[PDB]
Coordinates of C-alpha atoms and ligand atoms in Angstrom, one line a residue:
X1 CA 4.0 10.3 -29.6
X2 CA 0.6 9.7 -30.6
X3 CA -1.3 5.7 -30.0
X4 CA -4.1 5.1 -31.2
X5 CA -6.3 2.9 -27.5
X6 CA -10.3 1.5 -28.0
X7 CA -11.5 4.6 -26.7
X8 CA -9.9 6.9 -28.9
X9 CA -5.8 9.3 -29.5
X10 CA -3.8 10.4 -27.1
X11 CA -0.5 11.8 -26.9
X12 CA 2.1 12.2 -25.0
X13 CA 5.3 13.8 -24.5
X14 CA 9.1 12.8 -24.1
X15 CA 11.0 12.7 -21.1
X16 CA 15.4 13.1 -20.4
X17 CA 15.9 10.3 -18.6
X18 CA 19.9 9.5 -17.6
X19 CA 20.9 9.9 -21.7
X20 CA 18.1 8.3 -22.7
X21 CA 14.7 9.0 -23.4
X22 CA 11.5 8.2 -22.2
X23 CA 7.8 8.3 -23.2
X24 CA 4.7 9.4 -20.5
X25 CA 0.8 9.1 -20.3
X26 CA 0.6 10.2 -18.0
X27 CA -3.7 11.2 -17.0
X28 CA -5.3 8.6 -19.0
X29 CA -9.1 8.4 -17.8
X30 CA -10.4 4.6 -17.6
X31 CA -13.9 4.8 -16.6
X32 CA -16.3 7.4 -15.8
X33 CA -16.3 10.4 -13.6
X34 CA -18.8 8.3 -10.5
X35 CA -20.0 11.8 -10.0
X36 CA -23.6 12.6 -9.2
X37 CA -25.2 9.7 -8.8
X38 CA -22.6 7.3 -10.2
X39 CA -21.2 8.2 -7.1
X40 CA -20.2 5.2 -4.4
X41 CA -21.5 2.8 -7.5
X42 CA -19.1 0.7 -9.2
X43 CA -16.9 2.9 -11.7
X44 CA -18.7 3.0 -16.0
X45 CA -17.4 1.9 -18.7
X46 CA -15.5 4.9 -20.9
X47 CA -17.5 5.9 -24.3
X48 CA -14.7 6.4 -26.7
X49 CA -13.8 10.3 -28.0
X50 CA -12.6 11.4 -31.0
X51 CA -9.5 14.2 -31.0
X52 CA -6.5 13.3 -29.7
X53 CA -6.7 13.3 -25.6
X54 CA -3.9 15.0 -23.9
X55 CA -2.2 12.9 -21.3
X56 CA 0.3 15.2 -20.6
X57 CA 0.0 16.0 -16.9
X58 CA -1.1 13.7 -14.0
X59 CA -4.5 14.1 -13.8
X60 CA -6.7 14.7 -9.9
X61 CA -6.3 13.5 -7.2
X62 CA -8.8 11.5 -6.0
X63 CA -11.1 12.9 -2.4
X64 CA -9.6 12.6 0.9
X65 CA -9.0 13.9 3.9
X66 CA -5.4 15.3 4.3
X67 CA -2.3 14.7 7.1
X68 CA -2.1 18.2 9.0
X69 CA 0.1 17.2 11.5
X70 CA 3.5 17.9 10.4
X71 CA 2.6 21.9 8.0
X72 CA 5.5 22.8 6.3
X73 CA 7.7 19.3 6.9
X74 CA 8.5 17.1 4.1
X75 CA 9.2 13.9 6.6
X76 CA 4.6 14.6 6.4
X77 CA 4.4 16.7 3.2
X78 CA 5.2 14.3 0.7
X79 CA 2.5 12.5 1.1
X80 CA -0.3 14.3 0.5
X81 CA -2.0 14.7 -2.7
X82 CA -0.1 17.3 -5.2
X83 CA -2.6 17.5 -7.6
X84 CA -6.3 18.9 -6.8
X85 CA -8.5 16.5 -5.3
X86 CA -11.8 15.9 -7.3
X87 CA -13.7 13.1 -7.3
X88 CA -13.7 13.0 -11.2
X89 CA -9.9 11.2 -10.8
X90 CA -10.7 8.2 -12.2
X91 CA -7.2 7.8 -14.5
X92 CA -4.1 6.3 -14.2
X93 CA 0.0 6.9 -16.2
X94 CA 1.5 4.9 -18.3
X95 CA 5.3 5.7 -18.9
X96 CA 7.2 3.2 -22.1
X97 CA 11.1 2.7 -23.2
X98 CA 12.0 5.2 -26.7
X99 CA 12.5 4.2 -28.7
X100 CA 8.9 1.7 -28.0
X101 CA 9.7 -1.8 -26.7
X102 CA 8.8 -4.2 -28.8
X103 CA 6.1 -7.3 -26.5
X104 CA 7.7 -5.6 -22.9
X105 CA 6.5 -6.9 -19.4
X106 CA 4.3 -4.8 -17.3
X107 CA 4.5 -3.9 -13.9
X108 CA 1.3 -2.0 -12.3
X109 CA 2.1 -0.4 -9.0
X110 CA -0.9 0.2 -6.5
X111 CA -0.3 2.9 -3.6
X112 CA -0.8 2.5 -0.5
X113 CA -2.9 5.4 2.0
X114 CA -4.2 3.0 3.9
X115 CA -7.1 2.9 2.3
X116 CA -8.4 6.5 3.1
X117 CA -5.8 9.0 1.4
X118 CA -3.3 8.2 -1.6
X119 CA -2.9 9.3 -5.3
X120 CA -0.5 7.9 -7.6
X121 CA 1.6 10.9 -8.3
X122 CA 3.4 11.6 -5.7
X123 CA 6.6 12.5 -6.8
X124 CA 8.3 8.7 -4.8
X125 CA 5.8 6.5 -7.5
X126 CA 7.6 8.2 -10.7
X127 CA 7.9 5.4 -12.8
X128 CA 10.2 6.8 -15.5
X129 CA 13.7 5.6 -13.7
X130 CA 11.8 1.4 -14.6
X131 CA 11.0 2.6 -17.6
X132 CA 14.0 3.6 -18.4
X133 CA 16.6 1.6 -17.0
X134 CA 15.6 -1.7 -17.4
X135 CA 12.6 -1.3 -20.2
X136 CA 9.5 -2.1 -18.6
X137 CA 6.5 -0.2 -19.0
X138 CA 4.5 0.6 -15.8
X139 CA 1.8 2.2 -15.2
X140 CA -0.3 3.4 -11.6
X141 CA -3.9 4.2 -11.5
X142 CA -5.3 6.7 -9.2
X143 CA -9.1 4.6 -7.3
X144 CA -11.0 6.1 -4.6
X145 CA -10.2 5.3 -1.0
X146 CA -12.3 6.7 2.2
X147 CA -16.3 6.3 1.7
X148 CA -16.8 7.2 -1.5
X149 CA -14.5 4.3 -2.4
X150 CA -15.8 1.8 0.5
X151 CA -18.7 3.0 1.6
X152 CA -20.1 -0.5 2.1
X153 CA -24.3 -1.6 2.0
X154 CA -23.7 -5.7 1.1
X155 CA -25.8 -6.7 -2.2
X156 CA -26.8 -2.8 -2.6
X157 CA -25.9 -2.0 -5.1
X158 CA -25.7 1.7 -4.8
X159 CA -23.1 1.6 -2.7
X160 CA -22.2 -1.8 -2.5
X161 CA -18.1 -1.7 -0.6
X162 CA -14.8 -2.1 -2.7
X163 CA -15.7 0.5 -5.3
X164 CA -12.0 1.1 -5.0
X165 CA -10.9 -2.0 -5.2
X166 CA -13.4 -2.3 -8.6
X167 CA -11.1 1.2 -9.7
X168 CA -8.2 -1.0 -9.2
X169 CA -9.7 -3.4 -11.4
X170 CA -10.8 -2.0 -14.1
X171 CA -7.6 -0.5 -14.3
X172 CA -6.0 -4.0 -15.0
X173 CA -8.7 -4.9 -17.6
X174 CA -8.0 -1.5 -19.2
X175 CA -3.6 -2.5 -19.9
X176 CA -4.9 -5.7 -20.8
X177 CA -7.2 -4.7 -23.7
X178 CA -4.8 -1.6 -24.3
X179 CA -1.3 -2.6 -23.0
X180 CA 0.1 -4.3 -26.7
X181 CA -1.5 -0.8 -28.4
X182 CA 1.8 1.1 -26.4
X183 CA 4.1 -2.0 -27.0
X184 CA 3.4 -3.9 -23.4
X185 CA 2.5 -7.6 -23.1
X186 CA -0.5 -7.7 -21.5
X187 CA 0.9 -11.8 -20.7
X188 CA 3.2 -10.1 -19.1
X189 CA 1.5 -8.2 -15.8
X190 CA 3.4 -7.8 -12.4
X191 CA 1.0 -5.8 -9.8
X192 CA 2.6 -3.9 -7.1
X193 CA 2.2 -1.7 -3.8
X194 CA 2.5 -0.8 -0.3
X195 CA 1.2 -1.0 2.9
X196 CA -2.4 -0.4 1.9
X197 CA -1.1 -1.0 -1.5
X198 CA 0.4 -3.7 -1.3
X199 CA -2.6 -5.5 0.5
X200 CA -5.2 -4.2 -2.3
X201 CA -2.0 -6.7 -4.8
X202 CA -3.0 -9.8 -2.0
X203 CA -7.4 -9.0 -2.7
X204 CA -6.0 -8.9 -6.0
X205 CA -4.7 -13.1 -5.4
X206 CA -7.7 -13.1 -4.3
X207 CA -10.3 -12.2 -6.2
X208 CA -11.6 -14.1 -9.7
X209 CA -13.0 -11.6 -11.4
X210 CA -9.3 -10.4 -11.7
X211 CA -7.7 -14.1 -11.5
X212 CA -6.5 -13.6 -16.1
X213 CA -5.4 -9.8 -15.8
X214 CA -1.5 -10.3 -14.2
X215 CA 0.7 -12.5 -14.2
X216 CA 2.8 -12.1 -11.0
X217 CA 2.8 -9.5 -7.5
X218 CA 4.7 -8.2 -5.7
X219 CA 4.0 -7.1 -2.2
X220 CA 5.9 -4.3 -0.2
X221 CA 4.9 -3.5 4.0
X222 CA 1.2 -5.4 3.8
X223 CA -1.2 -7.8 3.2
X224 CA -4.7 -8.3 3.3
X225 CA -4.8 -10.2 7.0
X226 CA -2.8 -7.3 8.7
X227 CA -5.9 -6.6 11.3
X228 CA -6.5 -3.1 9.6
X229 CA -7.0 -4.7 6.7
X230 CA -10.3 -5.5 6.0
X231 CA -13.2 -3.7 7.6
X232 CA -16.0 -6.2 8.9
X233 CA -19.7 -6.3 7.9
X234 CA -20.4 -5.8 11.9
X235 CA -18.1 -2.2 11.6
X236 CA -18.7 -1.3 7.8
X237 CA -22.7 -1.1 9.0
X238 CA -22.2 0.9 11.8
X239 CA -20.2 2.8 10.1
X240 CA -21.7 3.4 7.6
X241 CA -24.8 4.4 9.1
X242 CA -23.1 6.7 11.8
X243 CA -21.4 8.7 8.7
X244 CA -25.6 8.7 7.7
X245 CA -26.4 9.9 11.5
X246 CA -23.3 13.0 11.5
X247 CA -24.5 13.8 8.2
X248 CA -29.0 14.0 8.6
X249 CA -28.7 11.6 6.6
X250 CA -30.6 8.0 8.7
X251 CA -33.9 7.1 6.9
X252 CA -36.0 4.2 6.4
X253 CA -34.8 2.9 3.5
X254 CA -31.2 2.7 3.2
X255 CA -31.7 3.7 0.2
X256 CA -32.7 6.2 -0.2
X257 CA -29.0 6.7 2.9
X258 CA -27.0 6.7 -0.3
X259 CA -29.6 9.1 -2.2
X260 CA -29.4 12.0 0.6
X261 CA -25.5 11.3 0.8
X262 CA -24.8 11.3 -3.4
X263 CA -26.0 15.2 -2.0
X264 CA -23.8 16.3 0.5
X265 CA -20.6 17.7 -0.7
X266 CA -17.7 15.9 -0.9
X267 CA -16.1 17.8 1.8
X268 CA -19.5 17.1 4.4
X269 CA -18.9 13.3 3.6
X270 CA -14.6 14.1 3.8
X271 CA -15.1 16.0 7.4
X272 CA -17.8 13.2 8.7
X273 CA -15.7 9.8 8.2
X274 CA -12.9 10.1 11.2
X275 CA -15.9 10.7 13.2
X276 CA -17.6 6.9 12.3
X277 CA -15.4 5.6 14.6
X278 CA -15.6 5.8 18.6
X279 CA -11.9 5.4 19.2
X280 CA -9.9 5.5 15.9
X281 CA -6.1 4.3 16.0
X282 CA -3.0 6.0 14.0
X283 CA -3.4 3.1 11.9
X284 CA -7.4 2.7 11.6
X285 CA -9.3 2.4 8.4
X286 CA -12.6 3.5 8.1
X287 CA -13.7 2.8 5.1
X288 CA -12.7 0.0 3.5
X289 CA -12.0 -4.2 1.4
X290 CA -15.5 -5.8 3.0
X291 CA -16.6 -9.8 2.0
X292 CA -18.7 -7.8 -0.7
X293 CA -20.0 -11.8 -2.0
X294 CA -19.0 -9.6 -5.6
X295 CA -15.0 -8.9 -5.8
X296 CA -14.7 -10.7 -2.2
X297 CA -16.7 -14.5 -2.0
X298 CA -15.5 -15.1 1.9
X299 CA -13.9 -13.9 3.9
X300 CA -10.4 -13.3 2.5
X301 CA -8.4 -15.3 6.0
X302 CA -10.4 -18.6 4.8
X303 CA -10.0 -17.9 1.8
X304 CA -6.3 -18.0 2.0
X305 CA -6.0 -21.2 4.8
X306 CA -7.9 -23.4 1.5
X307 CA -5.8 -22.3 -1.1
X308 CA -8.1 -20.6 -2.8
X309 CA -6.2 -17.5 -5.0
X310 CA -4.3 -17.8 -8.2
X311 CA -1.7 -19.9 -8.2
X312 CA 1.8 -17.6 -9.4
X313 CA 5.0 -16.6 -7.8
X314 CA 4.2 -13.9 -5.6
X315 CA 7.4 -11.6 -3.9
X316 CA 7.3 -10.2 0.2
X317 CA 9.2 -7.4 2.1
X318 CA 8.7 -5.7 5.4
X319 CA 10.9 -3.1 7.0
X320 CA 13.2 -3.5 9.7
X321 CA 10.9 0.0 11.5
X322 CA 7.3 -0.4 10.3
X323 CA 5.8 0.9 13.1
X324 CA 7.7 3.6 14.5
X325 CA 6.3 6.3 11.4
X326 CA 2.9 6.0 14.2
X327 CA 4.3 6.7 17.1
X328 CA 4.1 10.4 17.0
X329 CA 0.1 10.1 16.1
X330 CA -0.7 10.3 18.9
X331 CA 1.1 7.8 21.2
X332 CA 2.2 9.8 24.8
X333 CA 5.8 10.8 25.1
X334 CA 6.2 10.7 21.7
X335 CA 8.3 13.0 19.5
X336 CA 9.5 13.4 15.6
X337 CA 11.9 16.3 18.0
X338 CA 13.5 14.1 20.2
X339 CA 14.6 11.5 21.6
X340 CA 10.8 9.8 22.5
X341 CA 12.8 8.3 26.4
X342 CA 10.0 7.1 27.6
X343 CA 8.5 5.6 31.1
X344 CA 6.4 2.3 31.9
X345 CA 3.4 4.6 32.2
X346 CA 4.2 5.5 28.7
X347 CA 3.9 2.2 27.1
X348 CA 1.4 2.1 29.1
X349 CA -0.8 4.5 27.2
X350 CA 0.9 4.1 24.5
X351 CA -0.5 0.6 24.3
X352 CA -4.5 2.0 25.1
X353 CA -4.5 3.8 22.2
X354 CA -3.1 1.4 19.7
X355 CA -5.4 -1.1 20.8
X356 CA -8.3 0.6 21.9
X357 CA -10.5 -2.0 22.9
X358 CA -8.6 -4.9 24.0
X359 CA -9.3 -6.5 27.1
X360 CA -6.8 -5.4 30.3
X361 CA -5.4 -9.4 29.6
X362 CA -5.1 -8.5 25.9
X363 CA -2.4 -5.0 26.8
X364 CA -0.7 -7.3 29.8
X365 CA 0.4 -9.7 28.0
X366 CA 2.0 -7.5 25.4
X367 CA 3.8 -5.2 27.7
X368 CA 4.6 -9.0 28.8
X369 CA 6.5 -10.5 25.1
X370 CA 7.2 -7.4 25.0
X371 CA 9.5 -6.5 28.4
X372 CA 11.5 -9.1 28.9
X373 CA 14.3 -6.7 28.4
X374 CA 17.8 -8.6 27.7
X375 CA 19.0 -0.5 32.1
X376 CA 17.9 0.9 29.1
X377 CA 17.1 4.8 28.4
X378 CA 15.6 3.6 25.1
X379 CA 13.9 0.0 25.6
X380 CA 10.2 1.4 26.4
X381 CA 10.1 3.6 22.8
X382 CA 12.0 0.6 21.6
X383 CA 9.3 -2.0 22.3
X384 CA 6.1 0.3 21.0
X385 CA 7.6 0.7 17.7
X386 CA 8.2 -3.4 17.1
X387 CA 4.6 -3.9 19.1
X388 CA 2.9 -1.5 16.4
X389 CA 5.2 -2.6 13.7
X390 CA 4.6 -6.1 14.4
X391 CA 1.5 -6.8 14.9
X392 CA 0.4 -4.4 11.8
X393 CA 2.1 -5.7 8.8
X394 CA 6.1 -8.0 10.0
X395 CA 3.9 -10.9 11.4
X396 CA 1.1 -10.7 8.4
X397 CA 3.5 -10.7 5.3
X398 CA 5.2 -13.2 7.3
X399 CA 1.7 -16.1 8.1
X400 CA 0.1 -14.4 4.4
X401 CA 4.1 -16.0 2.4
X402 CA 4.2 -18.7 4.9
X403 CA 0.5 -19.9 3.9
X404 CA 0.5 -18.4 0.6
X405 CA 3.8 -21.0 -0.4
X406 CA 2.3 -24.0 1.3
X407 CA 0.4 -24.3 -2.0
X408 CA 3.4 -25.0 -4.0
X409 CA 4.4 -21.8 -5.8
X410 CA 8.1 -20.2 -5.1
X411 CA 7.4 -16.9 -2.6
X412 CA 10.8 -14.5 -2.6
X413 CA 10.6 -12.3 1.2
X414 CA 12.8 -9.6 2.1
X415 CA 13.6 -7.8 4.6
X416 CA 14.7 -4.1 4.0
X417 CA 17.1 -2.4 6.5
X418 CA 18.8 0.6 5.1
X419 CA 17.6 4.3 6.4
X420 CA 17.9 6.9 3.9
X421 CA 20.4 9.0 4.1
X422 CA 18.0 12.3 3.1
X423 CA 15.0 10.7 5.5
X424 CA 13.2 13.8 6.8
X425 CA 11.8 11.8 10.7
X426 CA 14.7 11.4 12.8
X427 CA 17.2 9.1 13.5
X428 CA 15.3 6.5 16.4
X429 CA 13.1 6.1 14.1
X430 CA 15.1 3.9 12.0
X431 CA 14.1 2.8 9.2
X432 CA 10.8 3.9 8.3
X433 CA 7.7 1.5 6.9
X434 CA 6.7 3.9 3.3
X435 CA 11.3 4.3 2.3
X436 CA 11.8 2.0 0.7
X437 CA 9.6 3.0 -1.8
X438 CA 12.4 5.5 -2.9
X439 CA 14.8 2.6 -3.9
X440 CA 12.0 0.3 -6.2
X441 CA 11.6 3.3 -7.8
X442 CA 14.8 4.3 -8.0
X443 CA 15.3 7.6 -6.8
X444 CA 18.9 6.7 -6.1
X445 CA 20.0 6.4 -9.3
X446 CA 19.7 10.1 -10.3
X447 CA 22.9 11.3 -9.6
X448 CA 21.4 15.2 -8.7
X449 CA 20.2 14.5 -5.3
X450 CA 22.6 9.7 -1.6
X451 CA 25.8 8.6 -1.7
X452 CA 27.0 5.9 -4.2
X453 CA 26.6 3.3 -2.1
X454 CA 22.4 4.4 -2.1
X455 CA 23.5 4.4 -5.8
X456 CA 24.1 0.6 -6.0
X457 CA 21.9 -0.8 -3.4
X458 CA 18.8 1.2 -5.3
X459 CA 20.1 -0.6 -9.3
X460 CA 20.0 -4.6 -7.4
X461 CA 16.9 -3.5 -6.2
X462 CA 15.5 -2.6 -9.7
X463 CA 17.1 -5.5 -11.5
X464 CA 15.8 -7.9 -8.6
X465 CA 11.9 -6.6 -8.8
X466 CA 12.7 -6.4 -13.3
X467 CA 13.7 -9.7 -12.8
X468 CA 11.4 -11.0 -10.2
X469 CA 8.3 -8.8 -12.6
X470 CA 9.5 -10.9 -16.0
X471 CA 11.6 -13.7 -15.0
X472 CA 9.3 -14.9 -12.1
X473 CA 13.4 -14.6 -9.8
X474 CA 14.4 -11.6 -8.4
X475 CA 17.7 -13.0 -9.1
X476 CA 20.6 -9.9 -9.8
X477 CA 22.9 -12.5 -12.0
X478 CA 25.3 -10.3 -13.3
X479 CA 27.6 -8.3 -9.9
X480 CA 28.4 -12.1 -8.4
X481 CA 25.6 -11.0 -6.5
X482 CA 23.5 -13.3 -3.2
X483 CA 21.3 -15.6 -4.7
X484 CA 17.6 -14.3 -2.6
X485 CA 16.2 -18.5 -2.0
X486 CA 12.7 -19.4 -2.1
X487 CA 10.7 -18.6 0.5
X488 CA 9.5 -22.2 1.9
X489 CA 7.7 -22.9 4.9
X490 CA 10.5 -25.1 6.7
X491 CA 12.8 -22.9 6.1
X492 CA 12.0 -19.6 5.9
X493 CA 15.0 -18.1 4.3
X494 CA 14.5 -14.6 3.5
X495 CA 16.6 -11.1 2.0
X496 CA 18.0 -8.9 3.5
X497 CA 18.5 -5.6 1.8
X498 CA 21.1 -3.5 2.9
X499 CA 24.2 -1.4 1.8
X500 CA 26.9 -3.1 3.6
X501 CA 26.3 -6.7 3.3
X502 CA 23.1 -8.9 2.0
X503 CA 22.3 -12.2 3.9
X504 CA 20.2 -14.3 3.3
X505 CA 19.2 -15.6 7.1
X506 CA 15.8 -17.5 8.5
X507 CA 12.5 -17.2 11.0
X508 CA 12.4 -13.4 10.6
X509 CA 11.0 -11.9 14.6
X510 CA 9.7 -15.9 14.8
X511 CA 9.2 -15.2 19.3
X512 CA 7.5 -12.4 17.8
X513 CA 5.4 -13.5 15.6
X514 CA 4.6 -16.7 17.2
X515 CA 2.8 -14.5 19.9
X516 CA 1.2 -12.2 18.0
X517 CA 0.0 -15.0 15.6
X518 CA -1.1 -17.5 17.4
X519 CA -1.8 -16.5 21.2
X520 CA -3.0 -12.7 20.4
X521 CA -5.8 -13.5 18.2
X522 CA -7.9 -15.8 20.5
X523 CA -7.1 -12.6 23.5
Ligands
LIG1 C1 -21.4 1.9 17.0 O1 -21.4 2.6 16.7 C2 -22.8 3.7 17.8 C3 -22.5 5.0 18.1 O2 -21.4 6.0 17.0 C4 -21.5 7.5 18.1 O3 -22.3 7.8 17.8 C5 -21.4 8.0 15.3 C6 -22.3 9.1 14.8 C7 -20.2 9.3 16.0 O4 -20.5 10.4 16.1 C8 -19.3 8.4 16.7 O5 -18.4 9.5 17.5 C9 -20.1 7.9 17.8 O6 -19.1 7.1 18.1 C10 -20.9 3.6 19.0 O7 -22.0 3.8 20.3 C11 -21.8 5.2 20.7 O8 -20.3 4.1 22.0 C12 -19.2 4.8 22.8 C13 -18.2 4.9 23.5 O9 -17.3 5.5 24.4 C14 -20.0 6.0 23.7 O10 -19.2 7.2 23.7 C15 -21.6 6.7 22.6 O11 -21.8 7.0 22.8 C16 -22.0 5.4 22.1 N1 -22.5 6.0 20.8 C17 -24.0 6.3 21.3 C18 -24.9 7.7 21.4 O12 -24.7 5.4 21.2 C19 -20.2 1.7 19.0 O13 -19.2 1.7 19.7 C20 -20.0 1.6 18.0 N2 -20.0 0.4 18.0 C21 -18.7 -0.2 18.0 C22 -18.5 -1.0 16.5 O14 -18.5 -0.5 19.1
LIG2 C1 9.1 15.3 23.6 O1 8.8 16.1 23.3 C2 7.3 15.7 23.3 C3 6.6 16.8 23.1 O2 5.8 18.0 23.4 C4 6.0 18.2 23.0 O3 6.5 18.7 22.4 C5 7.7 19.2 22.0 C6 9.7 18.5 21.6 C7 8.5 20.5 23.1 O4 7.9 21.4 21.9 C8 6.8 20.5 23.6 O5 6.4 22.3 25.1 C9 5.6 20.7 23.6 O6 4.9 20.1 24.4 C10 7.4 15.4 25.0 O7 5.9 15.3 26.0 C11 5.2 16.2 26.5 O8 6.2 15.9 28.0 C12 5.0 16.7 29.3 C13 5.8 16.8 30.8 O9 6.5 15.0 29.9 C14 3.4 16.4 29.6 O10 2.6 16.8 30.2 C15 3.2 16.5 27.4 O11 1.8 15.6 27.6 C16 3.4 15.1 26.7 N1 2.9 15.4 25.3 C17 3.1 15.0 24.5 C18 2.5 14.4 23.6 O12 2.6 13.5 25.4 C19 8.5 14.5 25.7 O13 8.4 14.5 27.3 C20 9.4 15.1 25.5 N2 10.8 14.2 25.7 C21 11.9 14.5 25.5 C22 12.4 15.8 25.9 O14 13.5 13.0 26.1
NAG3 C1 -3.1 18.7 -27.1 O1 -2.2 19.0 -27.1 C2 -2.3 19.6 -28.9 C3 -1.5 19.9 -29.3 O2 -0.4 20.7 -28.2 C4 -3.5 21.3 -28.5 O3 -3.0 21.5 -29.8 C5 -4.5 21.4 -29.1 O4 -4.6 21.7 -28.5 C6 -5.4 20.4 -27.3 N1 -6.5 19.9 -26.7 C7 -6.7 20.0 -25.6 C8 -6.3 21.4 -25.0 O5 -7.8 20.0 -25.6
NAG4 C1 4.8 -11.4 -26.4 O1 5.6 -12.3 -25.4 C2 4.1 -13.2 -25.5 C3 4.4 -14.3 -24.4 O2 5.0 -14.3 -23.7 C4 3.1 -13.1 -26.7 O3 2.2 -14.1 -25.9 C5 3.2 -12.6 -27.1 O4 2.2 -12.8 -29.3 C6 4.3 -11.7 -27.7 N1 3.9 -10.5 -28.1 C7 3.5 -10.1 -29.8 C8 5.2 -9.6 -29.4 O5 3.0 -10.1 -30.2
NAG5 C1 27.3 -4.2 -11.8 O1 28.1 -3.7 -11.9 C2 28.6 -2.3 -13.6 C3 30.0 -2.6 -13.1 O2 30.7 -3.4 -11.9 C4 27.5 -2.1 -12.8 O3 28.3 -0.5 -12.9 C5 26.0 -2.3 -12.2 O4 25.6 -1.3 -12.4 C6 26.0 -3.7 -12.0 N1 24.6 -4.3 -12.4 C7 23.4 -3.8 -11.4 C8 21.9 -4.7 -11.9 O5 23.8 -3.6 -10.4
CL6 CL1 -0.4 20.9 2.9
CL7 CL1 25.5 -8.7 -2.6

């Protein structure tokens, strides 16, 4: 199975899936390897080749630090790279239904990982179930992360910032220019991603250069207005400079700083990324998106508020316990191996861990808002998790959706509350950040693994996501399902996703978000 693309021929492989077949092209290059003088620069166009490029295995993952907090534990290791790390990592994957489709809608996945980690080859991102079951084409790309992907010297093409976002953009262009040859419709492309991947999707909604590269968008647990999503020009300068010093690259000429950094080995750069910030948190994004004046022309909050974004439909959602996952990466008294009952003192120490540069008054205000107990030994444990989840994910996703829908477009919001029967993390962590992904990709449809109720749930989510991509409406129209209403600034209706009963509810976390969205930004 050979497909002719603009830059050359590529050969795929046949996969058997649910008594059917899917053709996969894993590892197609979409840009010039960003090595040597190209390190830290925007991705460059790829020169044609002849011969047949074999896209039969996942390519290298981009350089990045790995989570070594729990060696041998599947809960954490399932997110680590499963392919060799390398600066030569600008590749993408394509899964297409078989027989070849005639004008299939295209879903483009952008992985998360705090803009410091991640890769498109993870098992939970395998696009073969969606291609098989919904007959859509699935594309996913690797983009640069960490300093190699986001180091910034605003204005300087040697390291302008947002390089990883331009990698994503160049892959979207590849789809525009080449997907028809695979039987895809470039006029029906939906971006979807989770966490930093969702934040990325939201930035493409803001970037004029990405406007014509896609049709609709799905944001799972993330948006650019989240507090960890955009690095300020101030922080970025201090960070690029701290990295320079830590690697012996400080120099009067900034362009000389970059030349020096280009001689360091990826490992010396990775090793020092951690220390570029005086005091970080388990949610630190040392090197992330910045207002570079190219991909992003102004502070995103201003663009959102003033309606400067691509006008189209959006599907946005969050999980019930977004914050718990981070508590075991630094909050005192927490452990994935016991019930983590903490005390008021520990809760207070926890706030210090998650809100390092916050005034004492700021922290007390968080404590006052979350400790008006409705006794229960797990009050403080549960409160710190909600504090972290509301501030970092839920409230920002809700504000993004409200502000976006005020300009006229249909928006749909979900609250995912099902805890995987297979979750390796303890029960107290609940419906964790990242654990809706396997349902969206259809892993529970594979019986060889999950309960019957999960197969059904995953089946409905898959259908709703596909209907959103193809038709701009996330409904499951055949099995007497709850209709998903549009989210409007007034009523604020949202759909809950679970195995029990799906319900229409209103004003998710109203009281908590008024605190984070209106008040807290002032302290
Ligand atoms: C901007 O960076 C300075 C410098 O950071 C230090 O040096 C870097 C190379 C790196 O190794 C960091 O870990 C160091 O902290 C920050 O200033 C530091 O502030 C802390 C406060 O706790 C102090 O203990 C250090 O001595 C200071 N570093 C020095 C030697 O001046 C500064 O905090 C950063 N600016 C911001 C955003 O606050
Ligand atoms: C839950 O465990 C934490 C973490 O302790 C580590 O992991 C445990 C499972 C066990 O193997 C310990 O020996 C490990 O050190 C406990 O938190 C520690 O508590 C002690 C005393 O309160 C304190 O001195 C340490 O600083 C704490 N460590 C951390 C990371 O906070 C916690 O007490 C346990 N809670 C329970 C059993 O409910
Ligand atoms: C690509 O795959 C074909 C068929 O498997 C093989 O003949 C060819 O040598 C491969 N090209 C390489 C390894 O460069
Ligand atoms: C695919 O459908 C689009 C409309 O969405 C149409 O413009 C295009 O011509 C179709 N592509 C094919 C099958 O040629
Ligand atoms: C609808 O119901 C049928 C049979 O009752 C079931 O097999 C199928 O998975 C359901 N389809 C969706 C999209 O949930
Ligand atoms: Cl490992
Ligand atoms: Cl239902």
